[PDB]
Symmetry: C5
Subunit: 283 residues, 5 copies
């Protein structure tokens, strides 16, 4: 694809917006606040391996990637034309919303005074993971796991075995180029398995950060004044193949810890995207 | 006043206004008495905890809320509007946290010695300047939390219905405007990134229980409020809206580790200029 | 005095002045005797704690206060004024905190072994350069604190009335000027962002009890003092005011965890030029 | 090609090459079997400790080593050489550390509950791109350490003599080249700043035992490899050398707190251009 | 030559010189024997503590001291002087801190298991490049500290009198020059910001007892030594002075938590140019 001039004229630039809700483990339904809906925005209680050779995490304890495909206005009446137009993502304003809610320390989490069961309800703390991507095709994924012996469910999550039709190999604990996928479904690809593939993603920009630990304070900034530029070193943004725009993210804030067996629940927050796009002549 | 034209020139075409917004941590400014509750002003009252997984009823005076003020600008009226160009803002009083001589939980609890533990823990700093109220998006830890119906504005105040599970993530139904001081809890109401076209807001959060508080202050830092097109917030009906919350953490008492939120006041000095509009 | 014109050129139109300000942590410079109290110079005396929720009376020698100096500039005299253009400032002596061979509370309390615990905890660094005293805004942790009525300047010194609940937030009545060294407690008096038009100040605070102290120092960093219009502080009556406080944390003794504040001295090298004024 | 001339223009004058380097934490890639040792690939084997002050004999499979690869470039031959201009490099797989559901030491050891403690502690990230092997300088914690003679390249491998006390500081005798993958221990061999004229390296270290691991990753960051004269690494005999190590910390087992190092793979995409040389 | 003129052009008008300065943590380079004390080279000997508030006598070999070297430049002599333009500097060997397989205090003290605790705690990194010795200002934790009279240069060495209480803050009488390697304790002697007109120095301090050490290293970073007028240090008598200290923290033994300071060597590569002076 040869990238030519910017298209000018009426409606040559557009802005589109979307929010992607977190996918921490509990699905959006049931909505009932007694039947499981109370866990929406969180994982269910993390379940642990029972031995070095018996690690079977439940699907609803595994945070997964959020994604959305946005369909842009059709540009080309005839794809056989020598010169065509594509939507180009120029920039994005993105924000993780709701960090203020972590200031709720009046609930029933493990308390800070364990002698008297007093103090405050311990706020969300621990490992944090924030990634977002904007591209003109699905985010390319590279698999890499802690333990190739982990017995992921065969139904309900897309894992390395889903792709290869074979059990994971020891190479999957490092970089195994066979273990690749595309982020083509929301709430299905676990973030402890699937990472942005630096060997592909030519038509996507992604930005990630990880902070580990168990009691690490969560940190977040938010403003409506920060623009993320999506143009590459040549001044070209992601080009939307068949007018499809792909948004991908995960925003883990840490865990809350309950008063029962120190059970941990992952917490995630929703992410806003406002993408500025322009029409680009291509051949 | 939709089409933004040239800057207005001449006498009184630029103005500076200043204000301080005091924190709204839970204890109201009155009663002033230092024995009848006034001693908690600048702080929350002691945080009260849920009694079960289904019984979380926080008292209003334990919930920090947004501070806000609407300032009236000089009368103006191709019309003219006041345009907010920049702001110098500062959180005042961090030095007061150096008081470690009080009666808080001491650092040596065995012998009741050491120092009075200073304010520590979760911190939250947001400010906004706009030409209309800050647009708010609701999102809570727990849609089952039983907020009081009177004395605070919560999601149910707006919807007239109980919160739903979607309120623990992003539910576009749960929106409000920051139109009252000391009423909108910060654990519920967040700046809405899908609106606020005419407001600039800047926020940061640092969590934890014993995290050291950190603050910088200088009179030399200017925050520019102009957008990508060089246009600042435009003050509808000559009203300028200031919004903030500045939580430094908690102090902890010697009685069952009772926590009190600590907030500090924020200064604003806004430069505004008249703008031609059509 | 008010209208700022061109820079003055010619012989001696620019000058550099330097000063060091020693910390004022609570123990005065005298007695010099290393047995009669002088051993605490550079530090506070042992921090004394409240005996109840209503009885908090800190001793003056436990309260760090602002350091300040007024320097006299060469006589001058459309008139001329000295204008402060820039400053190189440095906090000196952080290397001294590497002394872990003393008699502080040891790191192994089981065997009374390990190292002498180094200075740690809450840190506070502010400096200012101006053409008149630093304007101060009072704000306290506790309006009930019984500060001494002798040997220190507090809110009550200024107002002639006891503190009120508003003094725990921003009370605009509670203002002062930094006009004396070692007299204004830093837990009471903060730079006033509503004034200080003719001063530049820069501050930071890091809290906690065991927080590692952090400091950088170099002779290669210049702080510009010119405002947005290219004008530095103008020295009224040829007086230049320097203000600072540099708290590094506390050391802790082996006797009931008694804490002593540690401060360090700050160097200033100010570059000034003559400015025509009308 | 000592003298560097103009850039070569025309067809095929610029190229991009990519590679990934897997970590070398101690367990080799084979056996592949997940019961026969393959389950430790990407990790070290359990770190074994000294039995006395004079008996420190670490096993080879407990010692992380440098990763390296030599890539062959298109044949070229006033002569031409490949010049590395820039690199995009990324450490892949930090999300895998979010697995806290395994059988590591649990966060609640009193009841054996909570979560599986994630990887924490000392972290070390270095990468280099050059036109010849990375030059290494030896420096160790303890010159008395009894490294194996076979299976690792250590100081004694090079000198044919035991380590001396100078090897605990900078001993210029103790030098080597990174010419083999998975053989040079990172606790011994460091980039040599006195050499490496034709390589660029970038490193950082963060220590401690329970330190939270931190990592950023993006496909939008380019590292320029040009020196102060605008010249990148020149590839001798069309060979491009990539070198790295990326230690994230340790996992800790439920059996006597045995630690295993964790490494992650590093991606490189290098842009090269032809350069005229004389 | 006080007046600085044009740069000198022509053959050999620019030169580049390199050196490494080994750390001076307390144990001298000799004896070399790894049983007779050489095993501590690169480290201090075990830190010895005060026995009372009035009895603090640290041994010389427990006190880290400044490293320094004077390098002789090519002979030169309107005269010419060598001017230091820039320096590439690097602290080498942080990877050696990844040795957690030795006999230090273990991470699991209950069972004496886990890993050998890595170096942690207070860190101090300073370097300087100048045309004369680094100017030093004395400042101590405790003016009562009984430093040895022989084998170290301390305040009393210079003044011929015991330290005074002012030595715990800034006492202008307590000054020296860094004219000897491994002799000036870093807990006493600091770069003097009131002098050093012909030297650039850059320092940082991070305190605490278990703080994770942090270090970055690269061969791509240049430190410019030119002042605000574009003039670098001028080498008096063709002598170039390099000064540094690089403390990474302590290791802790299994015997009564004895601490040993760890230091690392520093590389310098200085670019110099001939300058016309009069
Ligand atoms: C309860 C249990 O042992 N669950 C266990 C499961 O055991 C199977 C059988 O349980 C059920 C069930 O989930 O209730 C019976 C159902 O009929 C069946 N549903 C259907 C549609 O067929 C399901 C279903 O088979 C399965 O869940 C699908 O995976 O199973 C049990 O009766 C029988 O003895 O054994 C059965 C098979 O072993 O088996 C699972 C493995 O297949 C799991 O082992 C499961 O344990 C749960 O695992 C999740 C992670 O997957 C998690 O760790 C969970 O721990 C939490 C949690 O839900 O996240 C941690 C929370 O902190 C904790 N909350 C509080 C406040 O303490 C929460 C509660 O303990 C739950 C446990 O379900 O109790 C409540 C609750 O949420 O508070 C109690 C409420 O009164 C109740 N509401 C009502 C209206 O009754 C809710 C409600 O049922 C659920 O929220 C709906 O999902 O549950 O545990 C860990 O328990
Ligand atoms: C005391 C109590 O049980 N409060 C409790 C409340 O109980 C109701 C009745 O108490 C009162 C009351 O607040 O005193 C009686 C009043 O007549 C009534 N007023 C009116 C106009 O009708 C109020 C009012 O109805 C209610 O507050 C409004 O909701 O109620 C009590 O007599 C009866 O037995 O039960 C009644 C309800 O059934 O009910 C509330 C819920 O409705 C709360 O449960 C409330 O508990 C307080 O809750 C807040 C959070 O909202 C907070 O956790 C508070 O804990 C603190 C605090 O005040 O923040 C934590 C502080 O750290 C702690 N300070 C110290 C130094 O220890 C502080 C003290 O323990 C308070 C307790 O009130 O004692 C002092 C004080 O501030 O130090 C003691 C002083 O001597 C006293 N001053 C004087 C001059 O006497 C002050 C002063 O009363 C108050 O500050 C004024 O507000 O109180 O507690 C937690 O107690
Ligand atoms: C000693 C005492 O009780 N002082 C308190 C004072 O008591 C009054 C009077 O002095 C008593 O004789 C009488 O019984 O009671 C009256 C009451 O009116 O009352 C004051 C209020 O007016 C205070 O309560 C005062 O207590 C002191 O308060 C300060 C804060 O204001 C400190 O908290 C102080 O504690 C320290 C300190 O000096 O900072 C903490 C420090 O860590 C301690 N140092 C050591 C090594 O342990 C010292 C130490 O305990 C002092 C107490 O004064 O003893 C020495 C010293 O080491 O400094 C012992 C020396 O032998 C002595 N020097 C000589 C030559 O004799 C030296 C010297 O007197 C003083 O330093 C000079 O100021 O004191 O305490 C807290 O005690
Ligand atoms: C087993 C043993 O003692 N090994 C040590 C070795 O002993 C020699 C010989 O093997 C013995 O039978 C005999 O008695 O003694 C001779 C020598 O005299 O000698 C070596 C020195 O030459 C070492 O001392 C060695 O000890 C091992 O040293 C390495 C470092 O080099 C590690 O510290 C290792 O500890 C681990 C490890 O493997 O990394 C720590 C780890 O966390 C442990 N894992 C778990 C789940 O607990 C393992 C574990 O204890 C190993 C011990 O080898 O057991 C398994 C395993 O889980 O990995 C058990 C499996 O069932 C087995 N698989 C099969 C199919 O049988 C598996 C497999 O043998 C190995 O992984 C292949 O390498 O081992 O220990 C430390 O033990
Ligand atoms: C041993 C002793 O008591 N030394 C103190 C010295 O005593 C003098 C004399 O040596 C004694 O025989 C006699 O009884 O008393 C006189 C003086 O009255 O006096 C000094 C003051 O003048 C000191 O008090 C000195 O104590 C030593 O002080 C230094 C600081 O100056 C250190 O704190 C030192 O502690 C360490 C150290 O050396 O740094 C801490 C370290 O962690 C320890 N290492 C280990 C592995 O445990 C060592 C260790 O205990 C030393 C003590 O010297 O023993 C060895 C060693 O391991 O280094 C044992 C070796 O076998 C030996 N080698 C040989 C071939 O014999 C080796 C060697 O002598 C020394 O390294 C040479 O310097 O010493 O202690 C603290 O002990």
């Amino acid at each position: 694809m040869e990238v030519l001039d910017l298209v000018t004229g009426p409606d040559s630039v557009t802005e589109i917006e979307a929010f992607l809700n977190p996918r921490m483990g509990q699905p959006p339904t049931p909505e009932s606040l007694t039947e499981g809906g109370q866990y929406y925005g969180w994982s269910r209680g993390i379940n642990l391996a029972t031995s070095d050779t018996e690690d079977s995490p439940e699907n609803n304890t595994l945070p997964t990637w959020s994604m959305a495909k946005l369909q842009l206005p059709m540009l080309n009446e005839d794809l056989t034309c020598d010169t065509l137009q594509m939507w180009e993502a120029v920039s994005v304003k993105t924000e993780v919303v709701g960090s203020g809610s972590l200031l709720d320390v009046h609930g029933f989490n493990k308390p800070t005074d364990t002698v008297n069961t007093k103090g405050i309800s311990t706020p969300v703390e621990g490992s944090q993971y924030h990634v977002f991507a904007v591209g003109g095709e699905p985010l390319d994924l590279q698999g890499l796991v802690t333990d190739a012996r982990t017995k992921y469910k065969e139904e309900g999550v897309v894992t390395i075995k889903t792709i290869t039709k074979k059990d994971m190999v020891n190479k999957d604990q490092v970089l195994n180029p066979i273990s690749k996928a595309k982020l083509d479904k929301d709430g299905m690809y676990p973030v402890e398995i699937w990472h942005p593939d630096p060997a592909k993603n030519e038509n996507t920009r992604y930005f990630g950060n990880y902070t580990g630990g168990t009691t690490t304070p969560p940190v977040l900034q938010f403003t409506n004044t920060l623009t993320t530029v999506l143009l590459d070193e040549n001044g070209v943004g992601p080009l939307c193949k068949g007018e499809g725009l792909y948004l991908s993210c995960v925003d883990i804030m840490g865990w809350r810890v309950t008063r029962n067996y120190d059970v941990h629940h992952w917490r995630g927050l929703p992410r806003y995207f406002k993408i500025t796009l322009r029409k680009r002549w291509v051949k």
